[PDB]
UniProtKB/TrEMBL annotation:
<feature type="short sequence motif" description="RCR-2">
    <location>
        <begin position="80"/>
        <end position="82"/>
    </location>
</feature>
<feature type="short sequence motif" description="RCR-3">
    <location>
        <begin position="140"/>
        <end position="144"/>
    </location>
</feature>
<feature type="binding site">
    <location>
        <position position="71"/>
    </location>
    <ligand>
        <name>Mg(2+)</name>
    </ligand>
</feature>
<protein>
    <submittedName>
        <fullName>NS1 protein</fullName>
    </submittedName>
</protein>
<feature type="active site" description="For nuclease activity">
    <location>
        <position position="140"/>
    </location>
</feature>
<feature type="binding site">
    <location>
        <position position="80"/>
    </location>
    <ligand>
        <name>Mg(2+)</name>
    </ligand>
</feature>
<feature type="binding site">
    <location>
        <position position="82"/>
    </location>
    <ligand>
        <name>Mg(2+)</name>
    </ligand>
</feature>
<feature type="domain" description="PV NS1-Nuc">
    <location>
        <begin position="1"/>
        <end position="174"/>
    </location>
</feature>
Length: 174
């Protein structure tokens, strides 16, 4: 059903933030989260920005189900976005180009320097794109606790609210 992939965000990209990134007007509901500040807020804004444009997007990404999770790199500085997405217009021949276009088109608006994110899809043993994204969400992504997971966006019923709920994420762990 749902594809899987990762985008890496080096810390150099955060340094190039312009006023459009900082002066974001969108609401980050941290009523059940850790305080989002500095680059964690910048990445939460970016992830919320990409989802916002996606909810009313057209083309192959219209009518798609998505679940994006930005997390801190486990051993280094920087972040990585776990990307789970799937839909009628979305197939293996355009998945990479659609995901890279979507995330980069938003990022261009928010930075001072020329940057590009590279999408790397999860591959099976035979090189075919993985399609176990919903179970990846359930068994792994939703079992992260902030601020290991920094922010999260989704349009899938059930995760629409639980995904940014620290108390619910601790339930999926236990």
């Amino acid at each position: 059903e749902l594809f899987r992939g990762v985008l890496h965000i080096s810390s150099n990209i955060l340094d190039c933030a312009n006023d459009n990134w900082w002066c974001s007007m969108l609401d980050l509901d941290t009523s059940d989260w850790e305080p989002l500040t500095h680059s964690n807020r910048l990445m939460a804004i970016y992830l919320s920005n990409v989802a916002s444009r996606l909810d009313f997007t057209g083309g192959p990404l219209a009518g798609c189900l998505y679940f994006f999770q930005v997390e801190c790199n486990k051993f280094e500085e920087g972040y990585h976005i776990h990307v789970v997405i799937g839909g009628p217009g979305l197939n293996a021949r355009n998945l990479t180009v659609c995901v890279e276009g979507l995330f980069n088109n938003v990022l261009y608006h928010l930075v001072n320097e020329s940057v590009k994110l590279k999408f790397l899809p999860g591959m099976t043993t035979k090189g075919k794109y993985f399609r176990d994204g919903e179970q990846f969400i359930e068994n792994y992504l939703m079992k992260k606790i902030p601020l290991n997971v920094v922010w999260c966006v989704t349009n899938i019923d059930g995760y629409i609210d639980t995904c940014i709920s620290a108390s619910f994420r601790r339930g999926a762990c236990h």
